[PDB]
From a paper:
Two glycosyltransferases (GTases), SdgB and SdgA, are responsible for the glycosylation of S. aureus SDR proteins such as ClfA and ClfB. SdgB first appends N-acetyl­glucosamine (GlcNAc) moieties onto serine residues (O-glycosylation) within the SDR domain using uridine diphos­phate N-acetylglucosamine (UDP-GlcNAc) as a donor substrate. The subsequent addition of GlcNAc to the glycoproteins is catalyzed by the second enzyme, SdgA, yielding glycosylated SDR proteins in which each SD repeat is decorated with GlcNAc disaccharide moieties. The glycosylation of SDR proteins mediated by SdgA and SdgB protects SDR proteins from degradation by host proteases, thereby circumventing innate immune attack.
Despite the biological significance of these two glycosyltransferases involved in pathogenicity and avoidance of the host innate immune response, their structures and the molecular basis of their activity have not been investigated. This study reports the crystal structures of SdgB and SdgA from S. aureus as well as multiple structures of SdgB in complex with its substrates (for example UDP, N-acetylglucosamine or SDR peptides), products (glycosylated SDR peptides) or phosphate ions. In addition to the dimerization role, the inserted domain was found to serve as a binding platform for the SD repeats before and after glycosylation. Altogether, the extensive snapshots of SdgB complexes in multiple states provided a mechanistic insight into how SdgB recognizes and glycosylates the clustered serine residues in the SDR proteins.
Residue numbers in the entry: 0 to 307, 312 to 317, 321 to 384, 388 to 500
């Protein structure tokens, strides 16, 4: 029996969902339950994006599966340059300021080659031209080395059809496209599998065929990128058990629990709930709201999305670990410091993150004369050891691995009471305080009270240590183990 965690891809910078999938894989591995990540989109770099985090046997990508390239690792290097020069007798001309070569048979321009690296060891693509210098085809190479896909062009370099190959060069898939709103859209997919041909109209139907090929009685699927994975599981039989995993708030308007439309990315899953064995959410609080909303039609279970040097060697250092985005309302932390510096002149606030609001934050900093007090700082382990308190002033939240980590480092926190995440990781007067949303006066008062009472900060710090230890690896392993056991027994 195999547990499959179905996402979309891995990027160069891992998203929240991708991290959650990899963290879950690692727990299942420690546990001794077989698990694999399952990826859906064609991504000829996937093997490189994955290398830092999972091995090749830890994942199955859909395109790899049908291209007979699952579990394949990197080919020994190949010097395309020498082969073109010495064995094909072509003429190479380097393109200034790049990794690209133009390729010629004497006076005739044949190809434009692009390498990933300055050393020309990783061929990326090769464009082909006809006698009129029309670009008729593009060859896309997998980072492992093999030619993965050829794309046939028409008119102004528009995508008409694509052919996907195994490492030996055999065609395994074909995709035909038509343009809508200026972009190519799949209209047909042919797959060569099991010595037959199979036909589909879109990638959702291809995905559903792929799930069906993977499944054996005893296996369990987890739907993690539901915008794509729910329409796929909807086209598969109910004999295949699948758990839906929510990674964010489930409705567009958190303040209308009963009537708000579901998030567009979850609509397909919620509109077909009886397909799913359960739903997993990261917080007890979101669990209660979703159960109510779906009238308990399937089980909802909260399982955190992750688990938890010298400590508290204490200037008064406040910290904020938060994207610089409007929902985070980081300007309020500036306003808090503006008010607190009069009473606390050795105060500092360090804001770790990035985003479109940095400009305005710097302007307010300069406006208030706080340049030696408030820092936009852009691994946070050394940053925690002297942190007095964390601040959260957001108007909406999710379960925060960042907050988990600062709590493991003994750093207490004062947060607005907003859904979801703060109530999960903060117990008032134990490891921090929860403040009525947008009540900046209560925020000031509570922040000042912890600054004026270091013995209170210390108790809160010791409670932060204690709170983090409830999220240990071994407690997560036990939650996951019990959940899978139970889910398979009921199915």
């Amino acid at each position: 029996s195999m547990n499959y965690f179905v996402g979309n891809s891995l990027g160069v910078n891992l998203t929240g969902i991708e991290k959650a999938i990899i963290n879950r894989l690692n727990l299942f591995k420690e546990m001794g339950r077989p698990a694999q990540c399952v990826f859906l989109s064609w991504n000829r770099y996937l093997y490189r994006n994955a290398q830092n985090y999972i091995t090749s046997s830890d994942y199955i990508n859909m395109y790899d599966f049908f291209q007979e390239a699952t579990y394949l690792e990197r080919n020994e290097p190949f010097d395309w340059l020498s082969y073109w020069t010495d064995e094909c007798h072509y003429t190479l001309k380097h393109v200034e300021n790049s990794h690209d070569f133009r390729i010629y048979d004497q006076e005739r321009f044949l190809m434009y080659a692009h390498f990933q690296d300055p050393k020309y060891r990783i061929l990326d693509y090769v464009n082909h031209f006809d006698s009129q210098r029309r670009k008729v085809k593009r060859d896309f190479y997998d980072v492992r080395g093999f030619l993965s896909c050829s794309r046939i062009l028409v008119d102004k370099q528009q995508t008409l059809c694509e052919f996907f190959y195994n490492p030996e060069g055999d065609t395994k898939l074909e995709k035909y496209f038509s343009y809508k709103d200026g972009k190519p859209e799949v209209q047909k997919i042919i797959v060569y599998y099991a010595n037959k041909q199979y036909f589909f109209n879109n990638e959702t139907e291809l995905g559903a065929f792929f799930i069906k090929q993977l499944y054996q009685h005893g296996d369990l699927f987890f739907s993690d990128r539901n915008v794509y994975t729910a329409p796929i599981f909807n086209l598969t039989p109910e004999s295949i058990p699948v758990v839906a995993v929510l990674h964010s708030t489930h409705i567009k308007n958190i303040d209308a629990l009963d009537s708000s439309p579901f998030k567009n990315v979850y609509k397909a899953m919620f509109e077909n709930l009886s397909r799913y064995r359960a739903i997993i959410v990261s917080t007890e609080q979101q669990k209660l709201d979703v159960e109510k909303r779906i009238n308990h039609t399937i089980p909802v279970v909260n399982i955190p999305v992750g688990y938890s040097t010298p400590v508290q060697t204490l200037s008064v250092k406040l910290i904020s670990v938060a994207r610089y985005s409007p929902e985070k309302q980081l300007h309020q932390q500036i306003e808090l410091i503006k008010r607190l510096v009069s009473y606390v002149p050795k105060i500092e606030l360090h804001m770790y993150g990035f985003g479109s609001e940095s400009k305005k934050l710097n302007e307010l900093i300069q406006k208030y004369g706080l340049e030696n007090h408030v820092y936009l700082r852009g691994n946070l382990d050394q940053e925690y050891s002297d942190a007095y308190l964390s601040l959260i002033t957001s108007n909406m939240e999710g379960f925060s691995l960042a907050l988990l980590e600062s709590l493991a480092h003994g750093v207490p926190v004062i947060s607005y009471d907003i859904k979801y995440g703060p109530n999960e990781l903060i117990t008032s007067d134990f490891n921090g305080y929860l403040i009525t949303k947008n009540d900046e006066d209560a925020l000031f008062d509570k922040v000042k009270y912890v600054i004026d009472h270091p013995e209170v900060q210390q108790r809160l710090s010791k409670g932060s240590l204690a709170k983090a230890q409830q999220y240990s690896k071994a407690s997560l392993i036990k939650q996951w183990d019990q959940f899978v056991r139970l889910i398979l027994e009921h199915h």
